[PDB]
Scaffold this active site. Structure first.
Site, PDB file in Angstrom:
ATOM      1  N   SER B 159       0.844  -1.189   0.000  1.00 16.06           N
ATOM      2  CA  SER B 159       0.000   0.000   0.000  1.00 16.06           C
ATOM      3  C   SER B 159       0.878   1.236   0.000  1.00 16.06           C
ATOM      4  O   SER B 159       2.101   1.141   0.183  1.00 16.06           O
ATOM      5  CB  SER B 159      -1.034   0.038   1.129  1.00 16.06           C
ATOM      6  OG  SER B 159      -0.591   0.775   2.250  1.00 16.06           O
ATOM      7  N   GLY B 161       2.140   2.661  -2.070  1.00 23.34           N
ATOM      8  CA  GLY B 161       3.249   2.469  -2.985  1.00 23.34           C
ATOM      9  C   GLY B 161       4.395   1.619  -2.388  1.00 23.34           C
ATOM     10  O   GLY B 161       5.289   1.190  -3.111  1.00 23.34           O
ATOM     11  N   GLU B 262     -10.960   2.890  -7.326  1.00 23.51           N
ATOM     12  CA  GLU B 262      -9.897   3.557  -8.076  1.00 23.51           C
ATOM     13  C   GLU B 262      -9.994   3.160  -9.524  1.00 23.51           C
ATOM     14  O   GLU B 262      -9.996   1.970  -9.843  1.00 23.51           O
ATOM     15  CB  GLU B 262      -8.509   3.197  -7.521  1.00 23.51           C
ATOM     16  CG  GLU B 262      -8.294   3.673  -6.078  1.00 23.51           C
ATOM     17  CD  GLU B 262      -6.893   3.461  -5.519  1.00 23.51           C
ATOM     18  OE1 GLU B 262      -6.649   3.555  -4.334  1.00 23.51           O
ATOM     19  OE2 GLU B 262      -5.962   3.142  -6.401  1.00 23.51           O
ATOM     20  N   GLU B 274      -8.191  -0.673  -8.533  1.00 21.65           N
ATOM     21  CA  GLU B 274      -8.342  -1.372  -7.262  1.00 21.65           C
ATOM     22  C   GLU B 274      -9.443  -0.649  -6.476  1.00 21.65           C
ATOM     23  O   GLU B 274     -10.030   0.333  -6.991  1.00 21.65           O
ATOM     24  CB  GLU B 274      -7.041  -1.481  -6.413  1.00 21.65           C
ATOM     25  CG  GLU B 274      -6.466  -0.092  -6.023  1.00 21.65           C
ATOM     26  CD  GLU B 274      -5.374  -0.058  -4.980  1.00 21.65           C
ATOM     27  OE1 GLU B 274      -4.995   0.975  -4.454  1.00 21.65           O
ATOM     28  OE2 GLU B 274      -4.901  -1.226  -4.648  1.00 21.65           O
ATOM     29  N   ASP B 281      -8.465   8.117   1.288  1.00 29.25           N
ATOM     30  CA  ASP B 281      -7.872   9.407   1.604  1.00 29.25           C
ATOM     31  C   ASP B 281      -8.202  10.569   0.684  1.00 29.25           C
ATOM     32  O   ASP B 281      -8.401  11.678   1.167  1.00 29.25           O
ATOM     33  CB  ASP B 281      -6.388   9.358   2.005  1.00 29.25           C
ATOM     34  CG  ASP B 281      -5.511   8.905   0.888  1.00 29.25           C
ATOM     35  OD1 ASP B 281      -5.942   8.752  -0.249  1.00 29.25           O
ATOM     36  OD2 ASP B 281      -4.265   8.672   1.282  1.00 29.25           O
ATOM     37  N   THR B 282      -8.295  10.314  -0.625  1.00 27.89           N
ATOM     38  CA  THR B 282      -8.609  11.355  -1.606  1.00 27.89           C
ATOM     39  C   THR B 282      -9.997  11.966  -1.351  1.00 27.89           C
ATOM     40  O   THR B 282     -10.283  13.134  -1.698  1.00 27.89           O
ATOM     41  CB  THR B 282      -8.496  10.852  -3.067  1.00 27.89           C
ATOM     42  OG1 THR B 282      -9.418   9.771  -3.270  1.00 27.89           O
ATOM     43  CG2 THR B 282      -7.057  10.485  -3.433  1.00 27.89           C
ATOM     44  N   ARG B 358       1.618  12.802   6.991  1.00 28.02           N
ATOM     45  CA  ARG B 358       0.503  13.704   6.760  1.00 28.02           C
ATOM     46  C   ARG B 358       0.003  14.222   8.097  1.00 28.02           C
ATOM     47  O   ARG B 358      -0.576  13.469   8.863  1.00 28.02           O
ATOM     48  CB  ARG B 358      -0.616  13.047   5.937  1.00 28.02           C
ATOM     49  CG  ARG B 358      -1.500  14.082   5.267  1.00 28.02           C
ATOM     50  CD  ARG B 358      -2.816  13.469   4.774  1.00 28.02           C
ATOM     51  NE  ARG B 358      -2.625  12.553   3.664  1.00 28.02           N
ATOM     52  CZ  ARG B 358      -3.195  11.355   3.516  1.00 28.02           C
ATOM     53  NH1 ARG B 358      -4.036  10.814   4.407  1.00 28.02           N
ATOM     54  NH2 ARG B 358      -2.889  10.673   2.415  1.00 28.02           N
TER      55      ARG B 358
HETATM   56  N1  LIG Z   1      -1.140  -0.056 -13.957  1.00 27.29           N
HETATM   57  C1  LIG Z   1      -0.995   1.130 -13.525  1.00 27.29           C
HETATM   58  N2  LIG Z   1      -0.881   2.077 -14.499  1.00 27.29           N
HETATM   59  C2  LIG Z   1      -0.660   3.414 -14.227  1.00 27.29           C
HETATM   60  N3  LIG Z   1      -0.510   3.923 -13.022  1.00 27.29           N
HETATM   61  C3  LIG Z   1      -0.606   3.007 -12.023  1.00 27.29           C
HETATM   62  C4  LIG Z   1      -0.811   1.637 -12.186  1.00 27.29           C
HETATM   63  N4  LIG Z   1      -0.856   1.026 -10.936  1.00 27.29           N
HETATM   64  C5  LIG Z   1      -0.639   2.042 -10.073  1.00 27.29           C
HETATM   65  N5  LIG Z   1      -0.521   3.265 -10.668  1.00 27.29           N
HETATM   66  C6  LIG Z   1      -0.406   4.603 -10.056  1.00 27.29           C
HETATM   67  O1  LIG Z   1       0.065   4.425  -8.787  1.00 27.29           O
HETATM   68  C7  LIG Z   1      -0.875   4.831  -7.768  1.00 27.29           C
HETATM   69  C8  LIG Z   1      -0.735   3.779  -6.706  1.00 27.29           C
HETATM   70  O2  LIG Z   1      -0.981   2.508  -7.344  1.00 27.29           O
HETATM   71  P1  LIG Z   1      -1.727   1.495  -6.370  1.00 27.29           P
HETATM   72  O3  LIG Z   1      -3.029   2.152  -5.956  1.00 27.29           O
HETATM   73  O4  LIG Z   1      -1.995   0.233  -7.120  1.00 27.29           O
HETATM   74  O5  LIG Z   1      -0.790   1.287  -5.113  1.00 27.29           O
HETATM   75  P2  LIG Z   1      -1.041   0.941  -3.583  1.00 27.29           P
HETATM   76  O6  LIG Z   1       0.233   0.532  -2.911  1.00 27.29           O
HETATM   77  O7  LIG Z   1      -2.009  -0.219  -3.496  1.00 27.29           O
HETATM   78  O8  LIG Z   1      -1.527   2.277  -2.883  1.00 27.29           O
HETATM   79  P3  LIG Z   1      -2.903   2.614  -2.150  1.00 27.29           P
HETATM   80  O9  LIG Z   1      -3.523   1.211  -1.638  1.00 27.29           O
HETATM   81  O10 LIG Z   1      -2.637   3.472  -0.949  1.00 27.29           O
HETATM   82  O11 LIG Z   1      -3.751   3.289  -3.204  1.00 27.29           O
HETATM   83  C9  LIG Z   1      -2.221   4.915  -8.478  1.00 27.29           C
HETATM   84  O12 LIG Z   1      -3.090   5.830  -7.798  1.00 27.29           O
HETATM   85  C10 LIG Z   1      -1.753   5.317  -9.891  1.00 27.29           C
HETATM   86  O13 LIG Z   1      -1.569   6.734 -10.072  1.00 27.29           O
HETATM   87 MG   LIG Z   2      -4.534   2.961  -4.917  1.00 29.00          MG
HETATM   88 MG   LIG Z   3      -3.994  -0.368  -2.762  1.00 27.08          MG
END
Ligand SMILES: Nc1ncnc2c1ncn2[C@@H]1O[C@H](COP(=O)(O)OP(=O)(O)OP(=O)(O)O)[C@@H](O)[C@H]1O
Ligand SMILES: [Mg+2]
Ligand SMILES: [Mg+2]
Ligand SMILES: Nc1ncnc2c1ncn2[C@@H]1O[C@H](COP(=O)(O)OP(=O)(O)OP(=O)(O)O)[C@@H](O)[C@H]1O
Ligand SMILES: [Cl-]
Ligand SMILES: [Cl-]
Ligand SMILES: [Mg+2]
Ligand SMILES: [Mg+2]
Ligand SMILES: [Mg+2]
Ligand code: NA
Ligand code: NA
Lengths: 386, 387
Positions: B159, B161, B262, B274, B281-282, B358
């Site tokens: 999560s 990133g 998302e 996802e 948060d957004t 944050r």
């Molecule tokens: N396949 C994809 N193509 C383009 N951008 C992506 C892709 N996967 C992720 N991103 C970008 O990265 C951000 C974070 O990706 P992701 O939501 O999958 O990560 P995360 O670790 O699960 O974070 P969180 O759960 O907090 O949203 C997205 O909001 C998007 O801008």
């Molecule tokens: Mg996300």
């Molecule tokens: Mg996520």
């Protein structure tokens, strides 16, 4: 303006003197800014205590008790929620460096009708009903004869319509006095025949005096039942209402939100009384504004500029005021009290033994009439048991 | 729906699993209804604990620890704020009769990319980036080879990133694979989607059905959202398609609550990314932009109450207050220049910071989304964060 982080050494501490539903929202607004909150009242588990960092229970009319809690907690601000508090101690504490909101003098003047009425009518020369004070039954009768019928008698220290009698004739003299004594000194006021009444929520802040749109309300047994905003009024009446409100707040002094009670007679406006803090009828602002009266009071007392206030359109509030005796109240049928443009608030009061304000229903609509019905209806749907 | 009075014998009890700023607003919304709140986290004085009736500090990943607190508090609702929880224990507890918001299955599917992704892409037949799962560098190395460049690699339990890497080149793979171990030993390799913009479609599943908030746009940076706004401008076709996707997803996950769906938008095409089985948060922009905030919506839904409708108050925006320093006594100066007409700020009460964190959020409304964003950004930027 500098704010610390609650619970940290540099925390900004706010003490609430009175932890009812009004204090509760002030606590939530302080908490939203990471302000440390200490909730004080005369009974445990009072609404604001539910959302405070720490709580204390004392006699708020006891200056000594007040000094002790203030010494213990060292708050930066003391924010009273009611009129019945140790105002002379507040004055002392203020002199000793405590920031009393809006100011100790404003609290001293308004804890009894004499201070505020004489200031408004005599010193500020604002229009008010006719009035006479009395400290004996006999002087009470003399006042009525001079004021005339009908008139209203009220204890000098009271709220929610307690101990008041609408006097139509000499027959009620004896009972009116008794009843008023049950709430020493009294005020005898001439009856104003207004077209309607309003609460003008006025904020005195670092950036000046601001006004919320006028709030109209319905009283029952001299207690608020429903409120709505905006209340339609002429341009002239609004302007005169604002002039009056501005004078009162500046005369009382200090930053905060005040609830200025006014009577409207066409284009004329008459001053009634004022809460030097958020007002019960102002709960409608929980749904009707971007910044509730609570958020506005917090903003102002912290020394921040108000800037402006947004009003979202026609709205109303309706109280949830059951009658029963219980220490374990429940609320059923909630699914029929909320929905589109409709919400409720349940205060968390630990018990009831007669009639007590346990919550409030809130609604918006295309007209105040429709909002009022929606809110009343919702409040009535709630099934209070205990 | 029957609600008792908090602290009283018949009280209705909500236990928050995660006490951050999002949990803080849910707590407030519960308190507004006289609902008893027990805030749980892995550190003391977490934001939601400030506004709760009581709190507990535990390792939320320790199922036994979880059962013990649950059993001690006998909550009527268990409300997670984050993915990092012993979901297995959630399942069990649900099996034993506990009410997990929205449902335990929903939490389980989404805490692991393999669950939600397969559900969405395969089961649901929804549009998603290309992707591949792998259990070895071989398989990884292999996969990236199947996806191509550029590509994203994420742990399957990641999560914010954490443990991710955007890969345009083979040299990275040294790193990539190792990083996917830093955070979180399995992963996903996703194709890169070139969208016009991303949105978060705040979707509430309640007794009266599914309702949507106006689409929320945002700007992410270093895996943290920076600004969000509403409503994000998109075609009706696109919006229609987005809602379809959202409905299908929320209903498949099941249970009442607010979901953060998302998505990516390219022209009139929408791609599922996802979803959070809880407020996102957004969506903090909803604290100024709607009659009912995402937090209020979540509570309304989980309590079994009807939503009816959601009112949007014109162009609005949020901009985070995200300083970077080390302190256990943060103060905020110049606040008078961060509030005003159509502008508010929130300060979370976090006890300390040691790096990037944050600490608050700025909220604004305006005549245009652009103007709203600037007003919010400017306000967040005026706050002086001292250590
Ligand atoms: N396949 C994809 N193509 C383009 N951008 C992506 C892709 N996967 C992720 N991103 C970008 O990265 C951000 C974070 O990706 P992701 O939501 O999958 O990560 P995360 O670790 O699960 O974070 P969180 O759960 O907090 O949203 C997205 O909001 C998007 O801008
Ligand atoms: Mg996300
Ligand atoms: Mg996520
Ligand atoms: N002189 C007056 N003429 C006409 N109506 C009056 C007069 N004084 C009071 N009322 C009516 O009675 C209501 C209650 O009066 P008042 O506000 O003085 O009582 P209270 O005990 O101080 O109540 P609270 O402090 O809760 O507002 C008013 O809101 C108004 O409807
Ligand atoms: Cl009072
Ligand atoms: Cl007199
Ligand atoms: Mg009064
Ligand atoms: Mg009153
Ligand atoms: Mg009054
Ligand atoms: Na507390
Ligand atoms: Na003061």
């Amino acid at each position: 303006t500098l704010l610390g982080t609650a619970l940290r050494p540099a925390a900004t501490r706010v003490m609430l003197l009175g932890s009812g539903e009004l204090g509760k929202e002030v606590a939530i607004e302080c908490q939203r800014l990471g302000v440390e909150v200490i909730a004080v009242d005369r009974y445990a588990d009072a609404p604001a205590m539910h959302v405070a960092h720490r709580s204390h229970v004392i006699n708020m009319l006891d200056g000594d008790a007040l000094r002790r809690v203030v010494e213990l907690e060292k708050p930066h601000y003391i924010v009273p929620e009611i009129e019945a508090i140790a105002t002379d101690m507040l004055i002392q504490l203020e002199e000793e460096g405590l920031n009393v909101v809006p100011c100790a003098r404003a609290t001293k003047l308004t804890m009894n009708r004499e201070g505020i009425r004489r200031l408004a009518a005599e010193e500020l020369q604002l229009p008010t009903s006719t009035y006479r004070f009395a400290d004996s039954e006999s002087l009470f009768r003399e006042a009525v004869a001079d004021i005339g019928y009908p008139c209203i008698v009220k204890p000098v220290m009271s709220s929610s319509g307690k101990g008041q009698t609408f006097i139509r004739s000499a027959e009620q003299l004896a009972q009116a006095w008794k009843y008023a004594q049950q709430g020493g000194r009294v005020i005898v006021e001439g009856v104003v025949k207004f077209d309607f009444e309003i609460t003008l929520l006025t904020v005195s802040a670092v950036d000046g005096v601001h006004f919320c749109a006028p709030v109209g309300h319905r009283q029952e047994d001299g207690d608020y039942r429903e409120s709505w905003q905006p209340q339609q009024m002429s341009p002239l009446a609004l302007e005169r209402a604002q002039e009056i409100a501005r004078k009162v707040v500046l005369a009382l002094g200090g930053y905060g939100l005040f609830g200025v009670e006014l009577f409207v007679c066409g284009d004329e406006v008459i001053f009634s009384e004022v809460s030097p803090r958020p007002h019960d009828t102002g709960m409608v602002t929980l749904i009707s504004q971007d910044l509730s009266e609570f958020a506005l009071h917090v903003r102002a007392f912290l020394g921040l500029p108000v800037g402006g206030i947004r009003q979202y359109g026609p709205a109303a509030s309706a109280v949830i005021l059951p009658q029963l005796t219980s220490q374990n109240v429940t609320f059923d049928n909630v699914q029929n009290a909320v929905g589109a443009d409709l919400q409720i608030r349940l205060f968390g009061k630990p018990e009831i033994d007669g009639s007590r304000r346990l919550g409030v229903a809130l609604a918006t609509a295309e007209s105040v009439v429709d909002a009022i019905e929606r809110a009343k209806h919702a409040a009535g749907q709630v099934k209070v048991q205990g």
